[PDB]
């Protein structure tokens, strides 16, 4: 998802299923590369729980 070479244009924005897998969100939130990382019904600190 995040390192795929080609992103979609916003008029035809892409949608990928994430399923039957473990998600370590501490790796995603620890990376300083994200200029914005805003969670709207949950805290990014809790996503691992």
């Amino acid at each position: 998802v995040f390192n795929a070479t080609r992103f979609a244009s916003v008029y035809a924005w892409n949608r990928k299923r994430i399923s039957n897998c473990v998600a370590d969100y501490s790796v995603l939130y620890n990376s300083a590369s994200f200029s914005t990382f805003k969670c709207y019904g949950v805290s990014p600190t809790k996503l691992n729980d």
């Binding site: 019904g41 949950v42 805290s43 600190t45 809790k46 729980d49």
Partner: protein, 97 residues
């Protein structure tokens, strides 16, 4: 006078053994007591504007500081749900006294 008394007490048994509703003044008290506790348990299911009605869904999902803004909504609405129940019960207790 005795036969009329014995026949009149006979009709108290026949009435109480027949009709379903004669103690309606006492069943109303039980029904009001039960309705007020069932209403008080229903007010736990309300959000009051919090993201959930359940503290475990707030404390699993939010951090220590974003949770308190949700927890205080639930505290404020519940605290008013108890003050309503206890005010209704203090007014209702004076009817029974």
């Amino acid at each position: 006078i005795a036969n009329q008394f014995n026949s009149a007490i006979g009709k108290i048994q026949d009435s109480l053994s027949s009709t379903a509703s004669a103690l309606g003044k006492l069943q109303d008290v039980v029904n009001q007591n039960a309705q007020a506790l069932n209403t008080l348990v229903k007010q736990l299911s309300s959000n009051f504007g919090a993201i959930s009605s359940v503290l475990n869904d707030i404390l699993s999902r939010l951090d220590k500081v974003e949770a308190e803004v949700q927890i205080d909504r639930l505290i404020t609405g519940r605290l008013q749900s108890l003050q309503t129940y206890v005010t209704q019960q203090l007014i209702r207790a004076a009817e029974i006294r």
